[PDB]
Design a protein around this ligand. Structure first.
Ligand code: FUM
Ligand code: FUM
Ligand code: FUM
Ligand code: FUM
Ligand code: FUM
Ligand code: FUM
Ligand code: FUM
Ligand code: FUM
Lengths: 439, 439, 439, 439
């Protein structure tokens, strides 16, 4: 019972579909896929017989392998591939003793492990990107629906000038659209790893002709990209995954702290989909991943410093944090879809909250309107003293302005009601939402 | 088959005893322990009947609970305790319907989860500290045995002056002894968490009298420390665990990169215990943890920034990285015991490597010996030109010194053989090892 | 004009006294102090003449040295000490040509640089600890004054149960008191660095007798601690500074996000000391450091992985992040003193905000009071439905309870007013503040 | 004298040209550039008179501003722009009192600061990319020259199979070419910041018409990119800089640890350009930055979590780490150019080191050659026992193979000399270098 990893300590991903893509047996399967695709590619190239490739492929199934034994024998070589290869070789030998000779021919641990890593990453990135696309669809709908829903723009925790929830949602959309675009691009460029014992491919084998044939076949068999050079110590793919997962988690973290700001008791402008404590749990889960993935990504970025032809530790430090980043970001993406899809916007509570500073939140809109008649510098100086006196006498900004002798008869009454209305001073928030949505 | 976490991606801890202390079901058990100890402490205080405490305790067993259901229901509240409490309540109800009313009385999720966290940490720290003590015993034996084993001190990757492997091992010992001392001190000071819904303990209940009685009983029932204040947002214990685990992993990482420097093909002064490639896998595993725990610790330290009376995410970000730190550091400690216990020191290869700079490595010892007869500044200037000319004419430093007219007749021949012997110029490395070992 | 570092990009420390302790010329001075104290200690031990020590000491003044030349010549050896030593040697030579021979005798770059580092750290830690003590005095006064000032405890961004600002301030005090205690302890244990070229002290020189005399004198001349072993690659002091600075910054970050939560427009329970936008700038500055020091500390912790007898890079990576940590934490400490000293608590706005959930915030206090008459499980179930119906019909919790037939005549009216008063349901917050303040 | 930042603690960038691009006065200048370009763009759009734009531009010079006063007044608002604007306004007022009214019209602190940030970043990225291009030119020459220079491939610190220094240098080239490509792309896409007080641009002003005219003019006046939306809390540009600087530093760190591995005393296959201790200082400096920038980048990535319309701290945490990343990576780039340009390759010492395992390093090449005559599985099993017996009897691998009865007469003597020659078993390293160089 002590082997089960249920997501007990990580509810942001527990029960979400990324768990099955990136669990230990999924990695074991990915490593078997890499082995079988290698023998298939070597067969298509002519270095081994097709019947051997067919038999190895048929045996390359996690169900044929003892996961716990493979994982526990890894301490002998610091990686699981030697144990895996021996287990796969016996499974093929049971059925086809001639094929077993061809398991793992000319190959090395890192080719199989890193190729499996990139296969797990490609499959997890497909899920992450599909969820990000779902989030973006919901966010674009929020952004269009609420183009004209006024609310208090908040800077450094205080009301500043009014804005629109549509504009805020378009910013959420911008981040999510950006992350989904990078996830898809990174997914299409993840490479296989075919290098041999020290990156010369000596074991797999005019020379340019057979290299390009084997590289083109291994790309076909794996579906992964063909890289310029073996990358056993050129860890660009891992640093890229590090970067796009930390960006994705951070972007989703941005939505999460925004929802928490808007969802708190004193504000109550939004609510997450549902004693009588409806805690914002979805944003809490997204945030919990955002406070984890960047630190994990930094450890992954440092592994670019990989010495010689295979690092004695820095490569080994990559596997678990890479799996965690995929897992946490995948959970956060799924959670963000749920959050964006079910978010409840309370437009009336937003309008009401605009009145909380007693007109101070429009005092830059009023300064602009008075500038033709007072001058820029004098209008600002006049609104500053009013905003302080209103924030002393407990009166509204309109009340205090209506007692300044400098202002008598300066505007028709109907125009004063229009100027003091926070719901009208939204700048060009509307034109910004359209340009965002036209893209 | 997709729930098994076997350590496939983390061989530094796979198969080591810390895995069972800190796996998901161990945390579930720790949380049940915290619940049962709370009811026992409330019974000893008088707030509930002892038979209820006895029945709750007997039901508070991981085998009575569905781990996967608890973990997957946590998405509803962002933590597993509500689901756990409901599962424990049904288990007690099957046997004793009056006791079930008392499960989780007056309590809150964070009291149970954090108390379980500190119980897991205390038990894992006991194992980590015991292994560190075993490493230190082996290191002290290496340090004593090799007090006089000369070798090249290396600075910025080049031979500098000679030293002793005993001195180097005493530095390893110093780090390990330091980490083991902090692990034991932190272990004795980990506190329970008894705060109630927002840290006032309103649900658990002249006032100073019943507080101190309940606090003293909960400390007795858990064996954990009693803290001054509820620490739901005073995350000192977690930051402390963060700090001592990152220090421990880093210290062990220091031994690991040293072994790798000494174990490489061109050096071969040590070997790890055992085609014909005996890779230093133990140091590789220790190093892999050292490249992971500090990044994880930094995420844990940032959670000190926990807003209000319970953070909406920063507390949630603590559980998985804390479990990983305990797990990776525990594996690294176990691996370090194996490395220190079986390390093979090749004293003759150390002596031979001292000769690789053709005497240049003793040219500060020779400058010291010539200073009475040449002057400090002139002896240094004279050894500099010799060390360059020897590093040009391909001759030894002794050969080049034997042609300088300034040096003719300056020392008896027997004294020249003594000065040029790298094995004698070890400074006070011997007296340093003794002082280290006297402590 | 391009050499000035004014704190333009780091307002949290600009203009604060820690800037002068840890600027480049302060480090140059600290390194000169380390040199001069070494010659003084070697003179007290008998290895050089006292007049040479007196002359070197008198020349060991930053004003006698070209800072920019020293800093720019460091690229030749990757550290400034060789250039510094040459500059100090000429300054002493101008006055006393016999003393100049004794500058830097038997020594090495790292002894001087790390000793200077620990001197800068000791002096900066004295300032940091003194400010933390000032913050703690103000916080203890806030905690005592507001022992009985009721306010809404907030968990996961929502009102939970009532608490007291006194309790919250006592938690702030707890963190600050803890950090100030560690800063002072670390300050008293910072060691000097006296190791020689590779940690054997060969250049500085029965053997145990002269070692202990030189070590005891260097401790006297520097005022720093004597360590068991040279620590050129045993980076415990740097990791300790890393840990206590990140803890300190994080603890202060906790106060800062709390103030921001309480200071926002919709809450307005506190204000920082002072158009009409009084942004919480002090908490913003403290927070900006809290989001920087932990990442810097993690880089410093990783340098525990220092290979051989002197690392070719990991030691060099320590200086700038260590200086930044001291600088940012020092600014944050000074800023926190200002924040704690001038914080404005609005007790009436706290009381008023308690009413925002229309009684829901007391529904656990009411469940406790009804338990003798309804049962624990039934009282909770009854308050849950009321809290939902009140959060639907827009009525208070008292209103909805007054229509449940189960509750008719259950309590005198006077007792209902007492139960529904949020200002009375503060648990044992009062007894917690006293215990905190008794320590 | 206490304001000078000379690079005393950071020799990797001291004296390098990036220091002047990113020092405090360069940022002050960049912020003045942003102000002046805004008034110019508002003039080209028609919102203010051109003579005012000309006068503001002429006054917008760091020499007209007190840097220290601006930096020290920032504590009042937590950023320097209010103080800067007041200083610029007086400078323009001295000459042209009508223009002074137009300084900073409709604008906000973050527009100016972030636009200045992106200007500093664009100018520093131009330098970083130009140096990376210089490094890549030198690396491509090393890669071509040494296409056929055999050397020991090293995996997990031990000889594995032979490779070529040309192949290794092509991997260095791959990383540097990749980083230089991303630096140039990021440089072309850095955006200006024009958002107004809360991202609605209310102060700067059918609506889509004037927005696009002002945005198109501000892009022209700054030379920066036009973004879809104001990005005051959409911190994609900063996270991108974070990512590409950490990648760049890490890639250069890879070259640095490789040089250190090859440059150490026992190996001596390369030397950096130049008693008799030629420490690898350039690689030490590059490495010191690689151990700093990733941690700094992680703090910068976390600031994607920026709440509301302007964060109360997370934006403020960006400036100093962003400047440090540009500064350290710029120094590392310059240092890497020097390292790649002057690197000394010792081809003969590489060939000699191939013999250190007494033929074991070719035992996979020999297994391949014997496979037609023994079988794959039996050839491997036969070379394993030989490699162990050779690593016991102290004999070469050829010697031990020449006594196995299974091998008698299996190959002509001339073919045995060819098989046992480490310089011939380089796999397809040659064809890999060409493909790398064709790109
Ligand atoms: O570390 C590995 O996976 C393989 C190393 C080797 O073959 O030498
Ligand atoms: O090739 C596969 O099996 C999966 C590819 C993907 O999920 O994108
Ligand atoms: O977050 C929890 O665990 C509990 C929150 C609450 O009771 O409000
Ligand atoms: O109390 C326990 O169950 C364990 C304590 C420990 O392992 O130290
Ligand atoms: O790195 C130093 O500071 C000194 C190195 C050496 O003396 O070899
Ligand atoms: O010894 C000094 O100069 C300063 C000591 C301190 O500031 O604590
Ligand atoms: O934080 C700033 O730079 C401006 C804030 C505001 O204008 O409210
Ligand atoms: O526009 C400038 O002033 C500089 C641009 C660049 O350096 O790339």
């Amino acid at each position: 019972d002590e082997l089960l990893d249920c997501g007990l300590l990580s509810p942001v991903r527990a029960g979400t579909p990324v768990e099955a893509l990136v669990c230990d047996s999924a990695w074991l399967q990915a490593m078997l896929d890499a082995e079988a695709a290698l023998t298939r590619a070597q067969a298509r190239t002519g270095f081994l017989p097709a019947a051997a490739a067919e038999a190895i492929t048929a045996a390359a199934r996690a169900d044929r392998i003892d996961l716990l034994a493979v994982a526990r024998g890894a301490r002998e070589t610091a990686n699981p591939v030697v144990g895996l290869v021996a287990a796969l070789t016996a499974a093929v030998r049971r059925d086809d003793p001639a094929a077993a000779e061809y398991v793992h021919r000319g190959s090395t641990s890192q080719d199989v492990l890193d190729t499996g890593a990139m296969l797990v990453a490609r499959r997890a990135l497909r899920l992450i990107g599909d969820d990000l696309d779902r989030a973006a669809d919901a966010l674009a709908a929020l952004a269009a629906d609420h183009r004209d829903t006024p609310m208090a723009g908040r800077t450094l925790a205080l009301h500043a000038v009014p804005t629109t929830f549509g504009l805020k949602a378009a910013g959420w959309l911008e981040l999510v659209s950006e992350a989904a675009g990078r996830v898809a691009r990174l997914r299409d460029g993840l490479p296989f790893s075919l290098g041999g014992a020290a990156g010369t491919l000596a074991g797999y084998f005019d020379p340019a002709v057979l290299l390009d044939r084997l590289l083109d076949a291994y790309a076909a068999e794996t579906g992964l990209a063909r890289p310029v050079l073996p990358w056993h110590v050129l860890r660009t793919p891992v640093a890229d995954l590090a970067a796009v997962l930390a960006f994705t988690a951070g972007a989703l973290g941005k939505i999460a702290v925004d929802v928490q700001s808007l969802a708190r008791t004193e504000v109550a402008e939004v609510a997450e989909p549902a004693p009588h404590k409806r805690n914002p749990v979805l944003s809490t889960l997204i945030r919990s991943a955002a406070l984890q993935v960047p630190a994990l990504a930094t450890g992954l970025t440092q592994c670019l410093v990989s010495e010689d032809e295979r690092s004695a530790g820095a490569w080994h430090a990559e596997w678990q944090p890479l799996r965690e980043c995929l897992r946490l970001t995948g959970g956060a993406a799924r959670t963000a879809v749920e959050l964006a899809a079910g978010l409840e916007v309370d437009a009336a509570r937003m309008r009401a909250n605009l009145d909380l500073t007693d007109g101070r939140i429009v005092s830059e809109s009023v300064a602009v309107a008075l500038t033709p008649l007072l001058g820029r510098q004098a209008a600002k100086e006049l609104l500053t003293r009013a905003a302080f006196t209103a924030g002393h006498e407990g009166r509204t900004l309109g009340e205090v302005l209506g007692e300044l002798p400098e202002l008598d008869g300066v505007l028709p009454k109907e125009r004063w009601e229009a100027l003091l209305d926070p719901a009208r001073a939204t700048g060009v928030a509307g034109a910004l939402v359209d340009g965002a949505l036209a893209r």
